Amino acid sequence: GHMIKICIAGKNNIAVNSLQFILKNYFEADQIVVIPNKNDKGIDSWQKSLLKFALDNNIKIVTLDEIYNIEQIIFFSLEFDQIIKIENFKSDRLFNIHFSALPKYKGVFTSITPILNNELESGVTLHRIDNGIDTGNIIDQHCFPIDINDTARDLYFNYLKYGESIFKKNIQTIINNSYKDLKQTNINSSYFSRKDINLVHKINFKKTSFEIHNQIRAFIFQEYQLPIINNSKIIKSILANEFIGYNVFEEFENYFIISGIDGFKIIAQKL
Amino acid sequence: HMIKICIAGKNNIAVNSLQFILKNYFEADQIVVIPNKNDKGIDSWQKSLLKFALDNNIKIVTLDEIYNIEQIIFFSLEFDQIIKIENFKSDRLFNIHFSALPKYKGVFTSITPILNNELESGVTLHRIDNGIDTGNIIDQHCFPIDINDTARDLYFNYLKYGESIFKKNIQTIINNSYKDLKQTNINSSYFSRKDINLVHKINFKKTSFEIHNQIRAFIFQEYQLPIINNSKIIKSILANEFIGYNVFEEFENYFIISGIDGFKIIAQKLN
Numbered sequence: 001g002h003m004i005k006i007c008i009a010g011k012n013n014i015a016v017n018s019l020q021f022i023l024k025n026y027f028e029a030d031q032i033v034v035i036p037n038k039n040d041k042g043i044d045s046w047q048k049s050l051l052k053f054a055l056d057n058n059i060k061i062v063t064l065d066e067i068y069n070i071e072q073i074i075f076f077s078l079e080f081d082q083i084i085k086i087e088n089f090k091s092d093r094l095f096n097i098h099f100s101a102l103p104k105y106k107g108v109f110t111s112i113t114p115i116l117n118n119e120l121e122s123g124v125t126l127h128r129i130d131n132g133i134d135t136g137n138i139i140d141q142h143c144f145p146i147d148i149n150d151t152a153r154d155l156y157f158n159y160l161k162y163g164e165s166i167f168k169k170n171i172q173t174i175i176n177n178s179y180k181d182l183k184q185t186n187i188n189s190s191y192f193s194r195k196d197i198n199l200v201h202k203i204n205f206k207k208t209s210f211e212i213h214n215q216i217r218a219f220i221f222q223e224y225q226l227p228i229i230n231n232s233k234i235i236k237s238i239l240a241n242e243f244i245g246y247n248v249f250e251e252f253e254n255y256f257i258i259s260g261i262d263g264f265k266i267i268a269q270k271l
Numbered sequence: 272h273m274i275k276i277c278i279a280g281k282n283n284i285a286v287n288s289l290q291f292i293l294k295n296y297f298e299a300d301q302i303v304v305i306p307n308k309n310d311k312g313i314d315s316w317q318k319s320l321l322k323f324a325l326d327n328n329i330k331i332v333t334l335d336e337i338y339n340i341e342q343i344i345f346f347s348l349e350f351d352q353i354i355k356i357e358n359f360k361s362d363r364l365f366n367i368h369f370s371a372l373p374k375y376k377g378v379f380t381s382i383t384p385i386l387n388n389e390l391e392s393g394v395t396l397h398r399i400d401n402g403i404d405t406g407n408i409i410d411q412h413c414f415p416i417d418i419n420d421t422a423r424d425l426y427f428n429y430l431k432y433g434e435s436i437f438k439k440n441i442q443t444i445i446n447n448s449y450k451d452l453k454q455t456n457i458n459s460s461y462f463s464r465k466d467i468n469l470v471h472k473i474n475f476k477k478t479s480f481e482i483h484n485q486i487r488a489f490i491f492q493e494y495q496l497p498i499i500n501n502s503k504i505i506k507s508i509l510a511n512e513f514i515g516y517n518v519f520e521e522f523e524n525y526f527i528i529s530g531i532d533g534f535k536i537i538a539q540k541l542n
């Protein structure tokens with residue numbers, strides 16, 4: 001019964017493209033509001049800007065305060081930067097797409113944490129927001145491989161793609177309020193906060209090849225940083241099955257050859 | 272040569288496995304033993320391999336004395352020395368490692384799988400090569416880490432399943448008719464002594480599952496118990512009752528704790 005039906009809060013391609021899907025299939029611009037993230041400067045770059053799309057397309061920019069009293073508003077967080085408190089809202093139609101295969105890897109830096117912890121797969125999960133961090137009941141989840149030479153930046157782009165997708169898969173039943181959900185288990189639940197990750201990663205070479213490789217490629221996301229070996233930035237790590245002896249470490253002009261305690265060949269490419 | 276087999280290592284896995292060969296396969300005369308450096312020659316919370324051997328007129332030797340024995344079966348059962356295979360005339364060199372290889376190579380394997388959130392572990396019979404726990408897998412038996420198992424419980428499961436896999440496989444080892452498969456690069460992990468601080472400092476900005484896991488991974492009373500506010504902890508119980516996020520309350524006999532997802536932990540203080 002209110003004029004505003006939906007708020008998209010967050011950033012990057014996932015937010016912008018999801019918003020474009022709703023504008024095309026579901027709601028007119030004047031039934032939509034957005035809350036861009038604090039660091040959104042309105043500039044299209046290696047990602048699309050939600051603030052810029054909103055301005056371009058005459059969608060009103062609001063704050064949380066302005067939406068708390070809108071009854072029945074659908075609130076959708078797509079890489080939103082604020083932890084909400086659900087008791088502020090009259091609506092209970094509050095959703096998030098989280099970049100991991102919940103209940104694993106709640107929290108932040110989820111293009112880093114699964115790689116660093118030796119996962120072969122990750123996922124995106126659509127869930128209701130409750131007062132905890134990525135703790136709410138799951139509505140849908142899509143799992144996908146972390147390929148053996150995927151970097152954190154590669155995995156991030158997979159989150160964006162599969163996330164956008166899981167949004168489109170589910171938005172109808174969310175708008176109809178006909179969706180199903182299930183509470184998260186206690187077991188397998190894991191969480192990382194910013195203080196658990198040191199973005200200047202010091203590599204522990206007394207590790208297997210797999211682990212050394214994981215350690216490198218988990219911090220490859222050039223827009224933010226690259227890992228450093230012997231004062232050289234690394235742009236790609238390649239892990240092979242080839243046995244080359246234990247604890248190999250050789251610096252060349254364009255790359256390092258590395259093996260860990262199990263002796264499998266890594267090529268770490270310089271930038 | 273008269274000597275057919277060396278059993279090297281410690282604890283009930285080594286003693287019972289030796290008793291089983293002495294009963295079914297070889298005479299005392301055909302067996303030599305290398306205890307670990309720390310073997311006291313008395314029974315304690317585990318039986319002494321040194322004592323068993325001396326009690327049964329099985330000769331105690333060093334690695335030097337066996338290198339030259341043609342065709343000897345060398346069988347490590349929690350042995351404390353990394354061998355170098357080119358020292359030996361025989362290539363019949365075997366180990367039972369207490370993990371589900373290729374995961375959790377190295378040490379402290381009753382801690383590492385719990386601390387890294389595993390639901391299961393395993394024992395793995397493999398050939399020894401020059402790396403640590405790297406050689407080809409001959410057999411493996413996987414079993415659960417129950418939700419409230421401690422490191423101590425895990426260890427006693429390794430000794431039991433470890434003894435069993437020895438008994439299952441030993442004839443084919445004697446007859447050299449066993450089969451094996453090289454280990455994969457993927458999923459391979461390793462922990463060395465320096466990776467684990469046996470005086471664990473709990474990170475409470477984690478899930479209840481992780482906090483519980485941190486506690487119970489260090490419960491091994493013969494060595495240490497984890498400490499919370501100066502009380503030693505003997506048992507951690509994780510329930511799927513929601514009690515609020517980030518609870519911490521101390522009582523006389525226990526703590527009530529929840530992490531970021533709010534599930535109830537009871538940490539029982541040692542009596």
Ligand SMILES: Cc1cn([C@H]2C[C@H](O)[C@@H](COP(=O)(O)OP(=O)(O)O[C@H]3O[C@H](C)[C@@H](O)[C@H](NC=O)[C@H]3O)O2)c(=O)[nH]c1=O
Pocket residue numbers: 078079080081096097098099107108109110111112134152156199219220221224225
């Ligand atoms: C800031 C930063 C990011 N990254 C990489 C890894 C990150 O997973 C990826 C995306 O970073 P970004 O700052 O957008 O967020 P993130 O930590 O993954 O995601 C968290 O922060 C978002 C604002 C929240 O919406 C997310 N909430 C989800 O339910 C949260 O998981 O960029 C670096 O390698 N280095 C960096 O310094």
Ligand SMILES: Cc1cn([C@H]2C[C@H](O)[C@@H](COP(=O)(O)OP(=O)(O)O[C@H]3O[C@H](C)[C@@H](O)[C@H](N)[C@H]3O)O2)c(=O)[nH]c1=O
Pocket residue numbers: 280348349350351368369377378379380381382422426469489490491494495
């Ligand atoms: C020394 C020590 C051990 N433990 C626990 C954790 C560990 O998994 C278990 C057995 O201790 P260990 O016998 O020192 O063996 P560990 O599991 O480190 O195994 C390692 O050392 C032995 C001697 C090798 O044969 C074995 N292949 C290695 O994996 O006891 C503790 O909790 N605290 C300790 O201080």
Ligand SMILES: Nc1nc2c(c(=O)[nH]1)N[C@H](CNc1ccc(C(=O)N[C@@H](CCC(=O)O)C(=O)O)cc1)CN2
Pocket residue numbers: 077080081082083084085086096107108129130131132133134135136192193194195
């Ligand atoms: N209610 C609630 N609000 C949400 C989500 C939720 O699922 N629950 N899902 C999204 C979560 N977004 C985040 C998640 C974490 C942080 C964050 O900033 N974490 C800090 C920790 C802050 C703290 O300890 O509380 C850190 O890692 O250092 C910020 C936005 C959006 N809003």
Ligand SMILES: Nc1nc2c(c(=O)[nH]1)N[C@H](CNc1ccc(C(=O)N[C@@H](CCC(=O)O)C(=O)O)cc1)CN2
Pocket residue numbers: 347350351352353354355356366377378399400401402403404405406462463464465
């Ligand atoms: N060849 C080789 N020898 C072996 C085994 C093997 O599968 N391969 N299997 C058994 C493994 N026993 C161990 C494993 C690790 C240590 C150990 O002492 N590790 C040190 C690291 C030592 C190092 O880096 O050299 C540490 O963690 O600080 C000792 C005995 C017995 N001997």
